[PDB]
Amino acid sequence: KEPVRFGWVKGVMIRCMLNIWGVILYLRLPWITAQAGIVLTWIIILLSVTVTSITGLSISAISTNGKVKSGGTYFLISRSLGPELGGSIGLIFAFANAVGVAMHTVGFAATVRDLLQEYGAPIVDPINDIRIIGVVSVTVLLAISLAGMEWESKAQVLFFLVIMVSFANYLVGTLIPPSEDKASKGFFSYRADIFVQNLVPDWRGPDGTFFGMFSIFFPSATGILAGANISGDLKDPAIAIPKGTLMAIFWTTISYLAISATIGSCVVRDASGVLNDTVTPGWGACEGLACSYGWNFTECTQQHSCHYGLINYYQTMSMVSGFAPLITAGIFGATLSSALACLVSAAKVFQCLCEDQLYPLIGFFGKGYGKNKEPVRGYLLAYAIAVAFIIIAELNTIAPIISNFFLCSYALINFSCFHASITNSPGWRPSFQYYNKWAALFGAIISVVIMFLLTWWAALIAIGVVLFLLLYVIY
Amino acid sequence: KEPVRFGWVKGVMIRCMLNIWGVILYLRLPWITAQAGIVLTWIIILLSVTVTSITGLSISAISTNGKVKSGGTYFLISRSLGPELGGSIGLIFAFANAVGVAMHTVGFAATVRDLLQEYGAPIVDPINDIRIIGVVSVTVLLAISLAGMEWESKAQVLFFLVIMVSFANYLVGTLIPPSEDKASKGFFSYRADIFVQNLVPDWRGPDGTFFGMFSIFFPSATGILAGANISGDLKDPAIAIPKGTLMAIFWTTISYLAISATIGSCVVRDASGVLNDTVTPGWGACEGLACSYGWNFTECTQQHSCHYGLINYYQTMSMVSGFAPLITAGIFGATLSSALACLVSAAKVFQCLCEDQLYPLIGFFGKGYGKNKEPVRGYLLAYAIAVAFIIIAELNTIAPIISNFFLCSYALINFSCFHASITNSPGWRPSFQYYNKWAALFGAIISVVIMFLLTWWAALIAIGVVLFLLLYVIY
Ligand SMILES: CN1[C@@H](CSCC(F)(F)F)Nc2cc(Cl)c(S(N)(=O)=O)cc2S1(=O)=O
Ligand SMILES: CN1[C@@H](CSCC(F)(F)F)Nc2cc(Cl)c(S(N)(=O)=O)cc2S1(=O)=O
């Protein structure tokens, strides 16, 4: 019985798009489109995908240099800068993936808890819901992923169709002439007067700054290494990984642009929500854009004390849509898919690190064979860390450190491509057309600049952990 | 004719105390003693001298390992971590010393300009005074230092006696019962009631924070490598450098403690300066500590709008003193001595780098022999940079970068001592008693933590310059 291999659509493209897409697409992008306007949000998106396209070109070059087993993303780091950084960056990549599993399972459990709190009775605790649901969900994900990889691929296809159904739902919803309940909350159909007004920024609050929007959005656009972490499970990686990875980046970027430019042309930033703010003939005069449509939000705007509209309501995308439960289904398929992708990625990197003769730090973890063609000893190690960080359940002070563990890998991958190309390393002959050393160097510099520019003490902790591991291995 | 050698008093101790002592001793320490109180200022001082004592122990260990020529402070960095960091850290040490020459000559020229603006007519420009005076002063310093090193040593002894005379002046001044002019500005003799009141903090203003006081004070306590940069000009460095360096640190620390604890027991933080704030019998009641001595500063304290007292007047030390011109003489001897020490240090490191066969980057600078036993080609290179940065004359936005160039050297010296001691390097047998690897490691970590904690973008620029030099040498 031969093992199973995947094509470039179900092996690289679907996985990369599903790992890129998260809950920012549903819960924060329409709000970023309000704080910053349409054109400046487009600039945010295009500045964020510039780093990931350069990293994608370095990854595509690495893939056209030979055959690499699954989880060997750090082999060029260890081959170009020594096996003590390579193993340490591999061990920190695999740990960040396992903590990302917990950060996505917590996000799924929060949605389920909010869903339960509205329909019926919860359990006695408000925050132990997030713990029980998180543990049961990660155990179900572990079961499906440990039952083979065809089942994991079928689950990923299910999540992809759920997300496409949510997109079609929202797009049909924006085309229906408004009802009273929608129009009172700020939704008007595609209008020429709302497109123009929403093009320019309107900053409000403590985080209402261009750098704050960049900080919220940038970490969500990463996730382009999901198809390259299973390179040994593909029919032919040297054609699959470049094409799939770059098509995934292109199409997620187009979806991000279309959603912002269409939400910004339908919903005004301020609305009351109550049904008796229609025009009263002879009410002197009213101020606001919606007056010409028949609504009066003057009291809100003057007092700044109502909770609807594009800039006040985080759930505006769910109400523009034709049927609201399908957006919740999309959120489920967007968080579970990323948790599953991160779990598979962490398991395979851990399994590659446990069988590394040049990095013998953690090779002692295996006692039972677990020879069922699956990384059982990398699955249990990822599951243990994921459950431990789910029990904590408060992960918003740990997210910067985990997100800098991912930019250290980006910096070292790009610099290893540059260092191997300028030194004429003996055995580095990439055949990808659109690769160039100076682009890789720029990516390596920008990754570290962004690392320190997001939060400097988290960057210090990340580099300190890398250094402690590297020096403990040497001594 | 043999060359001249110096003992441990005139070669290490005087030079180190004169480079440590600057203008913070005269113009900012009495104000730090007001913002933070006596005990918390003592904590500031003892936390700052903890880093420099550990670095002094590493330097003393380096000095008891053989004979090193003058300027070879980076030889252990290059011997323990490769000749591409050693030369780069040497080249950045020598450049920071030459910029420090300009930062001290500008401080001398500012004092002379203020002195001239009060007595007579200046030249037509207010800021070109600082340029003409700076250039002429650095040329005179270059002349005396290029005329041999006995003359430089005699100038240093002159500066030391001037500083001691200023200290005796101030200490006699604090013991004289107050006059009307002094008592009106806030000076009362040693009182028990003012010691107690001044022990606890009183924060005011934007920089009135413990971290702000630390930021102002810490960079001034460094300067402990002035006696180790001329190690090849001493009778026997292996006994001279440890004893002199540690005695210098000890005595400058004791002077810093005594000045703060005696200025804090004499001057109240708020005073008016005008002579008719004495007690009027029957003026209801007055609020403040000085009332029991016969003065009334209620209007000031309520309105926060007068310019005398320990926390408002930067020149309080000059008015407590018996004769005021001697404090200005002390300021002259405190800035010129540091400029001369930095110029000699930069010249000798540049001359050691120009004769290095393992770091051939700048060995091309020498055409004329200049064989008069003096680093002529390291003197002219230091003089050119000093004059170029004096012409700019605005150096308070460059000081953080230059001050991080000095903490990078501290971090790499300490880490090179640790790395050589744990690896059992072949030829590293220090015979200093009070050396220990873990103290050196702690010093190396604390230096980088402080580097990033003072100002993170300046630390990024410093590490980026080091990295650019290191990588340009490798490729
Ligand atoms: C959305 N993710 C962000 C981190 S944001 C949440 C945080 F972890 F920061 F808390 N970065 C990456 C990067 C990669 Cl490369 C991969 S992956 N599976 O391709 O290797 C996965 C992720 S992610 O899914 O965790
Ligand atoms: C008072 N100085 C501070 C820097 S504060 C002013 C700034 F430069 F930051 F702008 N640090 C050092 C360190 C050393 Cl080691 C030496 S020296 N001659 O021993 O090598 C001299 C100096 S300093 O005199 O420049």
Ligand code: NA
């Ligand atoms: Na997803």
Ligand code: NA
């Ligand atoms: Na001095």
